Ligand binder design. Structure first.
Ligand SMILES: O=C(O)[C@@H](CO)O[C@H]1O[C@H](CO)[C@@H](O)[C@H](O)[C@@H]1O
Ligand SMILES: O=C(O)[C@@H](CO)O[C@H]1O[C@H](CO)[C@@H](O)[C@H](O)[C@@H]1O
Ligand SMILES: [Mg+2]
Ligand SMILES: [Mg+2]
Lengths: 251, 251
């Protein structure tokens, strides 16, 4: 069994911490069940949370593996090997400039904003905001509600893809949580361990995650997607509920 | 006679340069008529143009005087003397945060953006964008057209004042081109010379300028505001026409 999990609004609470998930995470480790973060967050953010690889960052744009992963894949980088599935940030940013000219209006993202600004917009600290700005693949867009749709049309026109997390729209090319999950499973050392995958999430960018796993659990607000299990409460309490009710009684 | 003039879209061409205005400016200089910039631009931007004080920056937020101005006013600041009429930028920025809370959405300004982003948004060079970001009183806002109305009400509700230049809305408190022109006229060494003031402009932020002078000339693109003279062509060609037709005969 592998548990693939989104962070914001799923494993993490409103302050970007664990809440009741802590105990749930420990039980899984004790049972030897790998837990793989799959998030819109950057590697720098995942690191600051003390999460060890493997993990999937920037909506599936990058798969970070331990340097000594038993299956050879990716490009070595320090204590990691990195499998890049998506276009680099710089290329996305260049494409955004063309989308701007098309939309006939500015399209702003984290790359355009100071860390101070990103912090204010996200409620993160300036330092956490600096980590959120260290994007390798995916751009987080800052859009006024009323312009969203015109912007999305322009993104697609210039070859970019979009999704949204809990609060923000994203632009990237080749970043998909489902693609990344499928890839990581294919690269898993023990095929039997990866045979059954669970995926938990709460927003649009998690749909691909749900599709790519065997047991999908939605811990967001409202009704889950079709074919996805639900929990009584959202977020980390959802995660806890999910492990205890759906996972442990299988372990 | 003193000629008070806006810069962008009035004295400056589309590239923000004085080239086309040279001949008309030299006509005034040769006749010993002082010319005072009155602009939304910052001290740094005005200096980069090689314009000497007295000049009025940031929509009237600051009045800059020569170090040896005969009438002692304001305080020494970097080789000039400055008379601060408006709240400092820092206070405006803080009150903007209250506005954001009321509006329920981000309200972005230059202070939130990198020089690179400002450069892209304005067409200024990266160097010029840094100068445009060196704001002491007034914030230039970057707003979705669809959100302007809600945003402007939010500004009013938190005690900020707004206006707009050729392209951008602004927020400040106590910055009014008319108030600054009146203060400079009152601090003028030669009361006779200041007795007859001319004001030229092309946008909303110039209405206060027109109210504060004895002869107002509009060089923007619409019909002129009531009580203001028009010119056959906008911008620097309008400024030149006004000098030749309205001012020289009077001199
Ligand atoms: O789309 C969003 O709402 C979240 C995921 O739900 O990701 C963005 O927002 C987060 C801050 O809330 C950042 O940590 C991420 O890096 C990214 O910029
Ligand atoms: O409101 C505007 O459209 C113009 C009019 O002067 O000023 C802003 O825009 C200019 C750039 O076009 C900057 O040089 C100014 O500092 C200011 O930010
Ligand atoms: Mg989430
Ligand atoms: Mg103007």
């Amino acid at each position: 069994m592998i548990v693939f999990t989104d962070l914001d609004g799923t494993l993490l609470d409103e302050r970007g911490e664990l809440g009741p998930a802590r105990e749930a995470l420990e039980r899984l480790r004790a049972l030897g069940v790998p837990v793989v973060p799959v998030t819109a967050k950057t590697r720098k953010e995942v690191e600051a949370l003390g999460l060890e690889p493997p993990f999937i960052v920037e909506n599936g744009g990058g798969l970070y593996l331990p340097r000594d992963w038993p299956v050879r894949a990716g490009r070595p980088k320090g204590g990691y090997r990195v499998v890049s599935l998506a276009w680099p940030y710089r290329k996305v940013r260049a494409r955004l400039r063309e989308a701007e000219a098309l939309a006939g209006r500015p399209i702003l993202g984290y790359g355009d904003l100071t860390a101070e600004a990103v912090a204010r917009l996200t409620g993160l600290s300036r330092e956490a905001a600096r980590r959120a700005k260290a994007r390798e693949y995916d751009e987080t867009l800052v859009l006024c509600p009323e312009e969203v749709e015109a912007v999305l049309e322009a993104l697609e026109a210039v070859g970019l893809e979009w999704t949204h997390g809990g609060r923000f729209y994203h632009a990237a090319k080749g970043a998909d949580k489902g693609r990344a999950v499928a890839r990581l499973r294919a690269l898993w050392p023990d095929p039997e361990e990866a045979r059954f995958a669970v995926g938990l999430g709460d927003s649009l960018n998690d749909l691909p995650l749900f599709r790519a796993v065997d047991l999908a659990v939605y811990v967001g607000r409202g009704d889950p997607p079709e074919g996805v299990l639900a929990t009584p409460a959202p977020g980390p309490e959802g995660f806890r509920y999910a492990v205890e009710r759906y996972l442990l009684p299988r372990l």
